[PDB]
Design an enzyme around this catalytic site. Sequence first.
Site, PDB file in Angstrom:
ATOM      1  N   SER A  12       0.840  -1.291  -0.009  1.00 20.30           N
ATOM      2  CA  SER A  12       0.204  -0.054   0.003  1.00 20.30           C
ATOM      3  C   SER A  12       0.813   1.440  -0.050  1.00 20.30           C
ATOM      4  CB  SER A  12      -0.898  -0.026   1.130  1.00 20.30           C
ATOM      5  OG  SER A  12      -0.185   0.275   2.378  1.00 20.30           O
ATOM      6  N   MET A  89      11.269  -6.561   5.222  1.00 17.14           N
ATOM      7  CA  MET A  89      11.555  -7.134   6.556  1.00 17.14           C
ATOM      8  C   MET A  89      12.937  -7.756   6.489  1.00 17.14           C
ATOM      9  SD  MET A  89       8.957  -6.169   8.366  1.00 17.14           S
ATOM     10  CE  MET A  89       7.400  -5.609   8.025  1.00 17.14           C
ATOM     11  N   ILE A  91      17.371  -7.021   8.116  1.00 14.07           N
ATOM     12  CA  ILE A  91      18.307  -6.043   8.340  1.00 14.07           C
ATOM     13  C   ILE A  91      19.242  -6.049   7.118  1.00 14.07           C
ATOM     14  CG2 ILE A  91      20.049  -5.828  10.117  1.00 14.07           C
ATOM     15  CD1 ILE A  91      18.014  -7.739  11.721  1.00 14.07           C
ATOM     16  N   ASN A 106      13.664   4.813   4.706  1.00 10.79           N
ATOM     17  CA  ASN A 106      12.700   3.913   5.323  1.00 10.79           C
ATOM     18  C   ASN A 106      11.505   4.463   6.142  1.00 10.79           C
ATOM     19  OD1 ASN A 106      11.930   0.895   6.293  1.00 10.79           O
ATOM     20  ND2 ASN A 106      12.529   1.709   8.134  1.00 10.79           N
ATOM     21  N   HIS A 108       9.313   3.795   9.043  1.00 12.58           N
ATOM     22  CA  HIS A 108       9.080   2.981  10.483  1.00 12.58           C
ATOM     23  C   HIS A 108       7.753   3.166  11.264  1.00 12.58           C
ATOM     24  CE1 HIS A 108      10.294   1.487  14.743  1.00 12.58           C
ATOM     25  NE2 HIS A 108      10.004   0.383  13.931  1.00 12.58           N
ATOM     26  N   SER A 135       7.327   7.196  11.456  1.00 14.77           N
ATOM     27  CA  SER A 135       8.503   8.122  11.160  1.00 14.77           C
ATOM     28  C   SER A 135       9.083   7.663   9.668  1.00 14.77           C
ATOM     29  CB  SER A 135       9.677   8.242  12.005  1.00 14.77           C
ATOM     30  OG  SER A 135       8.920   8.492  13.579  1.00 14.77           O
ATOM     31  N   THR A 140      20.538   3.878   8.387  1.00 11.24           N
ATOM     32  CA  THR A 140      21.867   3.730   8.915  1.00 11.24           C
ATOM     33  C   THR A 140      22.320   2.563   9.261  1.00 11.24           C
ATOM     34  OG1 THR A 140      22.443   6.052   8.757  1.00 11.24           O
ATOM     35  CG2 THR A 140      22.778   4.917  11.055  1.00 11.24           C
ATOM     36  N   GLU A 142      22.717   1.244  12.452  1.00  9.41           N
ATOM     37  CA  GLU A 142      22.059   1.210  13.473  1.00  9.41           C
ATOM     38  C   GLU A 142      20.253   1.032  13.291  1.00  9.41           C
ATOM     39  OE1 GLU A 142      21.732   3.098  17.201  1.00  9.41           O
ATOM     40  OE2 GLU A 142      19.763   2.297  16.749  1.00  9.41           O
ATOM     41  N   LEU A 143      19.981  -0.225  13.534  1.00 13.46           N
ATOM     42  CA  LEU A 143      18.804  -0.677  13.247  1.00 13.46           C
ATOM     43  C   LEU A 143      17.466   0.230  13.857  1.00 13.46           C
ATOM     44  CD1 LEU A 143      16.086  -2.683  13.448  1.00 13.46           C
ATOM     45  CD2 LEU A 143      17.870  -3.017  11.519  1.00 13.46           C
ATOM     46  N   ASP A 144      16.767   0.571  12.875  1.00 14.30           N
ATOM     47  CA  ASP A 144      15.728   1.889  12.973  1.00 14.30           C
ATOM     48  C   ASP A 144      16.394   3.192  13.574  1.00 14.30           C
ATOM     49  OD1 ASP A 144      13.563   0.705  11.730  1.00 14.30           O
ATOM     50  OD2 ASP A 144      13.325  -0.786  13.252  1.00 14.30           O
ATOM     51  N   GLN A 172      -1.425   8.047   7.380  1.00 17.23           N
ATOM     52  CA  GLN A 172      -0.534   9.021   7.457  1.00 17.23           C
ATOM     53  C   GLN A 172       0.664   8.724   6.674  1.00 17.23           C
ATOM     54  OE1 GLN A 172      -1.283  12.029   9.224  1.00 17.23           O
ATOM     55  NE2 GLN A 172      -3.102  10.758   8.867  1.00 17.23           N
ATOM     56  N   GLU A 173       0.992   7.103   6.520  1.00 18.42           N
ATOM     57  CA  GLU A 173       2.240   7.034   5.811  1.00 18.42           C
ATOM     58  C   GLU A 173       1.899   7.110   4.458  1.00 18.42           C
ATOM     59  OE1 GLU A 173       2.687   2.627   6.687  1.00 18.42           O
ATOM     60  OE2 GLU A 173       4.068   3.248   8.355  1.00 18.42           O
TER      61      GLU A 173
HETATM   62  N1  LIG Z   1      20.822  -1.715   8.643  1.00 13.80           N
HETATM   63  C1  LIG Z   1      19.568  -1.416   8.652  1.00 13.80           C
HETATM   64  N2  LIG Z   1      18.904  -0.361   9.299  1.00 13.80           N
HETATM   65  C2  LIG Z   1      17.770   0.019   9.465  1.00 13.80           C
HETATM   66  O1  LIG Z   1      17.454   1.251  10.104  1.00 13.80           O
HETATM   67  C3  LIG Z   1      16.867  -0.885   8.840  1.00 13.80           C
HETATM   68  C4  LIG Z   1      15.620  -0.464   8.857  1.00 13.80           C
HETATM   69  C5  LIG Z   1      14.379  -1.579   8.552  1.00 13.80           C
HETATM   70  C6  LIG Z   1      14.127  -2.306   9.750  1.00 13.80           C
HETATM   71  N3  LIG Z   1      13.039  -3.218   9.506  1.00 13.80           N
HETATM   72  C7  LIG Z   1      12.942  -4.372   9.982  1.00 13.80           C
HETATM   73  C8  LIG Z   1      11.980  -5.248   9.253  1.00 13.80           C
HETATM   74  C9  LIG Z   1      12.253  -6.545   9.772  1.00 13.80           C
HETATM   75  C10 LIG Z   1      12.961  -7.057  10.720  1.00 13.80           C
HETATM   76  C11 LIG Z   1      12.903  -8.693  10.962  1.00 13.80           C
HETATM   77  O2  LIG Z   1      12.279  -9.592  10.246  1.00 13.80           O
HETATM   78  N4  LIG Z   1      14.043  -8.712  11.542  1.00 13.80           N
HETATM   79  C12 LIG Z   1      14.399 -10.207  12.105  1.00 13.80           C
HETATM   80  C13 LIG Z   1      14.927 -11.256  11.133  1.00 13.80           C
HETATM   81  C14 LIG Z   1      16.322 -10.980  10.560  1.00 13.80           C
HETATM   82  C15 LIG Z   1      16.231 -10.176   9.325  1.00 13.80           C
HETATM   83  O3  LIG Z   1      15.714  -8.924   9.587  1.00 13.80           O
HETATM   84  O4  LIG Z   1      17.081 -10.225   8.478  1.00 13.80           O
HETATM   85  C16 LIG Z   1      15.279 -10.008  13.477  1.00 13.80           C
HETATM   86  O5  LIG Z   1      15.997 -11.059  14.027  1.00 13.80           O
HETATM   87  O6  LIG Z   1      15.258  -8.821  14.067  1.00 13.80           O
HETATM   88  C17 LIG Z   1      14.169  -6.196  10.918  1.00 13.80           C
HETATM   89  C18 LIG Z   1      14.318  -4.699  10.903  1.00 13.80           C
HETATM   90  C19 LIG Z   1      15.014  -2.836   7.378  1.00 13.80           C
HETATM   91  N5  LIG Z   1      16.455  -3.011   7.889  1.00 13.80           N
HETATM   92  C20 LIG Z   1      17.450  -2.045   8.112  1.00 13.80           C
HETATM   93  N6  LIG Z   1      18.572  -2.224   8.057  1.00 13.80           N
HETATM   94  N1  LIG Z   2      10.377  -1.023   9.923  1.00 13.36           N
HETATM   95  C1  LIG Z   2       9.532  -2.135   9.193  1.00 13.36           C
HETATM   96  C2  LIG Z   2       8.004  -2.044   9.204  1.00 13.36           C
HETATM   97  O1  LIG Z   2       7.646  -2.523  10.130  1.00 13.36           O
HETATM   98  N2  LIG Z   2       7.210  -1.135   8.236  1.00 13.36           N
HETATM   99  C3  LIG Z   2       6.071  -1.108   7.953  1.00 13.36           C
HETATM  100  O2  LIG Z   2       5.534  -1.850   7.172  1.00 13.36           O
HETATM  101  C4  LIG Z   2       4.081  -1.607   6.662  1.00 13.36           C
HETATM  102  C5  LIG Z   2       3.997  -2.021   5.083  1.00 13.36           C
HETATM  103  O3  LIG Z   2       2.790  -1.672   4.588  1.00 13.36           O
HETATM  104  P1  LIG Z   2       2.472  -2.100   3.227  1.00 13.36           P
HETATM  105  O4  LIG Z   2       2.902  -3.397   2.814  1.00 13.36           O
HETATM  106  O5  LIG Z   2       0.916  -1.844   2.789  1.00 13.36           O
HETATM  107  O6  LIG Z   2       3.391  -0.880   2.337  1.00 13.36           O
HETATM  108  C6  LIG Z   2       4.034  -0.127   6.746  1.00 13.36           C
HETATM  109  O7  LIG Z   2       2.822   0.252   7.314  1.00 13.36           O
HETATM  110  C7  LIG Z   2       5.347   0.348   7.549  1.00 13.36           C
HETATM  111  O8  LIG Z   2       5.189   1.155   8.475  1.00 13.36           O
END
Ligand SMILES: Nc1nc(=O)c2cc(CNc3ccc(C(=O)N[C@@H](CCC(=O)O)C(=O)O)cc3)cnc2[nH]1
Ligand SMILES: NCC(=O)N[C@@H]1O[C@H](COP(=O)([O-])[O-])[C@@H](O)[C@H]1O
EC number: 2.1.2.2
Length: 209
Positions: A12, A89, A91, A106, A108, A135, A140, A142-144, A172-173
């Site tokens: 979406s 989803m 890292i 990204n 979040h 947000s 970077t 640093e995760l999120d 809002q997104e």
């Molecule tokens: N380096 C980096 N920085 C970020 O800020 C970042 C932002 C999103 C953070 N989003 C997410 C979304 C899903 C998972 C997730 O499924 N994590 C599981 C599985 C391992 C994997 O993510 O590869 C975990 O163990 O946390 C993590 C972060 C995507 N990657 C990024 N990667």
């Molecule tokens: N940090 C990762 C994360 O959780 N992001 C979230 O995934 C959703 C995807 O929506 P969509 O598939 O309808 O675009 C979004 O709502 C976004 O904020």
Amino acid sequence: MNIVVLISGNGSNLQAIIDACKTNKIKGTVRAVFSNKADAFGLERARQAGIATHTLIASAFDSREAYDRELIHEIDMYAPDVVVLAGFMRILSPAFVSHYAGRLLNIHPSLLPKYPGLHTHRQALENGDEEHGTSVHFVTDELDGGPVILQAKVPVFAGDSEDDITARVQTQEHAIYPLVISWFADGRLKMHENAAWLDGQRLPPQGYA
Ligand SMILES: Nc1nc(=O)c2cc(CNc3ccc(C(=O)N[C@@H](CCC(=O)O)C(=O)O)cc3)cnc2[nH]1
Ligand SMILES: NCC(=O)N[C@@H]1O[C@H](COP(=O)([O-])[O-])[C@@H](O)[C@H]1O
């Protein structure tokens, strides 16, 4: 300006980017959509809009660093000016982030720094927060935790289920993510290490326009 977007699911936010591009609210266009999920509905949204689709399953790759180098390899065929994470989803490894440094974005679903991982809506609900949000930030290592560009706050009420906070936040997104990609596309928005800068002004930690 070439944008590629990475998704893992419904698409979406992707759809909103496609529609803004189409009406030239973003002076630029989505060249390719990448998924790590073969069933992601966002790929059918890309496909119906005539954008190139690519699924890259990590089962196949034996190593994180390895999956990310094929993904860099494929993305760069489209020569992206900005790559945007919209529901992705995974890292991304230091190398990926280092490669797209400055042009990796990204969204979040939390008012950062507040719930910097997964399950953020359920955290808002369980901590009885008044206010929830979303947000947009520069990615970077640093995760999120890269510099925030723009947040939109939302009310969380009372007889509110996770689905209700979820759909309220998603609304809002769909409005603030096309808008910060157009500030990037017009050359207004820049990172100069750990700081986000709109119109030459260093932005404050919670963003703002
Ligand atoms: N380096 C980096 N920085 C970020 O800020 C970042 C932002 C999103 C953070 N989003 C997410 C979304 C899903 C998972 C997730 O499924 N994590 C599981 C599985 C391992 C994997 O993510 O590869 C975990 O163990 O946390 C993590 C972060 C995507 N990657 C990024 N990667
Ligand atoms: N940090 C990762 C994360 O959780 N992001 C979230 O995934 C959703 C995807 O929506 P969509 O598939 O309808 O675009 C979004 O709502 C976004 O904020």
